[PDB]
């Protein structure tokens, strides 16, 4: 009767991996004969199978069925092994296989805590994923970022640790600098946004990349042909999260200033997107604290009228962030704007 | 950024 269509797809994938593993065990560096060349994924119809699994993974019912059959392990194993075998290849079959595999993993980690945990526990795969950010396929990078994004969203303690340990933050930030396509960059930044919320080390590792803060401030005035605000919302959200670290560092503060950050950030308080506002409010909350030059430069661009608008908003993060930023500016005035003078 | 399905 019952076809077990999905089971048969996973068996193919499991089988191919066993064969690759067998080839890896024979063909190590201290090596025996090369009278057995590698398994090639084209020769065992692997794209088709992973492709169909990828397709089915969009639907939630199918995901539930895969999860009973251990589909996540299987697909992650497949991705890992094709990376470990063929490196940073350009072959279309390997890149397509890797993409489909990654998309399936994006879908299987979406909304599922057990799977996020599980995939993160697979450390050889995590390393393989992170290394793919250096691929020449930005379409693949877009996928890998998307995986990393979902793993970093509500990561438990272990998953967070692992994500840091495999060098994900520093690799995505370097990835971002080189990305030429918008869709790719959206995912890269979305992942970084999630990751920057985790811990100090991640914030630190972002700021510590050559061109990073320059680039991030640049995203705040990104010109989209997509007629979309998602790059500004993401890059701004990253900046807001790292700004706690920037606040207390002058070298970094300086890089913002020489790219007109605070000027731009004030224009964001106007902006129509509640996200762009919330981001700019929380960024200023930290940059308006305990630094005299920036404190005054904000007075001299009329931040106080601007922040007075927002203090009575129903949106808590706008209300807090603008009030807090205002309070810093109030309680540390240039003489000119004191109550005693100029009433 | 939250979580999402694959594009």
UniProtKB/Swiss-Prot annotation, chain A:
Residues of the full protein shown: 407 to 743 of 2843
Function: Tumor suppressor. Promotes rapid degradation of CTNNB1 and participates in Wnt signaling as a negative regulator. APC activity is correlated with its phosphorylation state. Activates the GEF activity of SPATA13 and ARHGEF4. Plays a role in hepatocyte growth factor (HGF)-induced cell migration. Required for MMP9 up-regulation via the JNK signaling pathway in colorectal tumor cells. Associates with both microtubules and actin filaments, components of the cytoskeleton. Plays a role in mediating the organization of F-actin into ordered bundles.
Entry's localization field: Cell junction, Adherens junction; Cytoplasm, Cytoskeleton; Cell projection, Lamellipodium; Cell projection, Ruffle membrane
UniProt disease link: Familial adenomatous polyposis 1: An autosomal dominant cancer predisposition syndrome characterized by adenomatous polyps of the colon and rectum, but also of upper gastrointestinal tract (ampullary, duodenal and gastric adenomas). This is a viciously premalignant disease with one or more polyps progressing through dysplasia to malignancy in untreated gene carriers with a median age at diagnosis of 40 years. Desmoid disease, hereditary: An autosomal dominant disease characterized by multifocal fibromatosis of the abdominal wall and mesentery. Desmoid tumors can also affect paraspinal muscles, breast, occiput, arms, and lower ribs.
Quaternary structure note: Forms homooligomers. Found in a complex consisting of ARHGEF4, APC and CTNNB1. Found in a complex composed of MACF1, APC, AXIN1, CTNNB1 and GSK3B. The complex composed, at least, of APC, CTNNB1 and GSK3B interacts with JPT1; the interaction requires the inactive form of GSK3B (phosphorylated at 'Ser-9'). Interacts with APC2. Interacts with DLG1 (via PDZ domains) and DLG3 (via PDZ domains). Interacts with alpha- and beta-catenins. Interacts with AXIN1 (via RGS domain). Interacts with ARHGEF4 (via N-terminus).
Post-translational note: Phosphorylated; phosphorylation enhances the F-actin bundling activity. Phosphorylated by GSK3B.
UniProt name for this protein: Adenomatous polyposis coli protein
Gene this chain is encoded by: APC
Species name: Homo sapiens
ARM repeat ranges per the UniProt record: 53-95, 105-147, 148-191, 192-238, 239-283, 284-325
Family the UniProt entry places it in: Belongs to the adenomatous polyposis coli (APC) family.
Domain of life: Eukaryota
Swiss-Prot/TrEMBL domain comment: The microtubule tip localization signal (MtLS) motif; mediates interaction with MAPRE1 and targeting to the growing microtubule plus ends. The basic region (residues 2167-2674) mediates the association with both microtubule and actin proteins and promotes the bundling of F-actin.
Tissue and organ distribution: Expressed in a variety of tissues: brain, small intestine, colon, thymus, skeletal muscle, heart, prostate, lung, spleen, ovary, testis kidney, placenta, blood and liver. Isoform 1A: Very strongly expressed in brain but has relatively low expression levels in other tissues. Isoform 1B: Predominant form in all tissues except for brain, including gastric mucosa and blood.
Lineage of the species this protein comes from: Eukaryota, Metazoa, Chordata, Craniata, Vertebrata
Miscellaneous section: APC mutations have led to some interesting observations. (1) the great majority of the mutations found to date would result in truncation of the APC product. (2) almost all the mutations have occurred within the first half of the coding sequence, and somatic mutations in colorectal tumors are further clustered in a particular region, called MCR (mutation cluster region). (3) most identified point mutations in the APC gene are transitions from cytosine to other nucleotides. (4) the location of germline mutations tends to correlate with the number of colorectal polyps in FAP1 patients.
């Amino acid at each position: 009767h019952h076809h077990h269509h999905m089971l048969h797809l996973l068996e193919q994938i499991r089988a191919y991996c066993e064969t690759c593993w067998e080839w890896q065990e024979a063909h190590e560096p201290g090596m025996d004969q090369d009278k057995n060349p590698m398994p090639a994924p084209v020769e065992h119809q692997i794209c088709p199978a992973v492709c169909v699994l990828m397709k089915l993974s969009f639907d939630e019912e199918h995901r539930h069925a895969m999860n009973e059959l251990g589909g996540l392990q299987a697909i992650a194993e497949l991705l890992q092994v094709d990376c470990e075998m063929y490196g940073l290849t350009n072959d279309h079959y390997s890149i397509t296989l890797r993409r489909y595999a990654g998309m399936a993993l994006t879908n299987l980690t979406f909304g599922d805590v057990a799977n996020k945990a599980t995939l993160c526990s697979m450390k050889g795969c995590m390393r393989a994923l992170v290394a793919q950010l250096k691929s020449e396929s930005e379409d693949l990078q877009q996928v890998i970022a998307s995986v990393l994004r979902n793993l970093s969203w509500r990561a438990d303690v272990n998953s967070k640790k692992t994500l840091r340990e495999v060098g994900s933050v520093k690799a995505l930030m370097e990835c971002a600098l080189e990305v030429k396509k918008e869709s790719t960059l959206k995912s890269v930044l979305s992942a970084l946004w999630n990751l920057s919320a985790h811990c100090t080390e991640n914030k630190a590792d972002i700021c510590a990349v050559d061109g990073a803060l320059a680039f991030l401030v640049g995203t705040l005035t990104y010109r989209s042909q997509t007629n979309t605000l998602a790059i500004i919302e993401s890059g701004g959200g990253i900046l807001r999260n790292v700004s706690s670290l920037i606040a207390t560092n002058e070298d970094h503060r300086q890089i913002l200033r020489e790219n007109n950050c605070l000027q731009t950030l004030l224009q964001h308080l106007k902006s129509h997107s509640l996200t762009i506002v919330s981001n700019a409010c929380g960024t200023l909350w930290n940059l308006s604290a305990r630094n005299p030059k920036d404190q005054e430069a904000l007075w001299d661009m009329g931040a106080v009228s601007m922040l007075k608008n927002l203090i009575h908003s129903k949106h808590k993060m706008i209300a807090m962030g603008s009030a807090a930023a205002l309070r810093n500016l109030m309680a540390n005035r240039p003489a000119k704007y004191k109550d005693a003078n100029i009433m | 950024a939250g979580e999402a399905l694959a594009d």
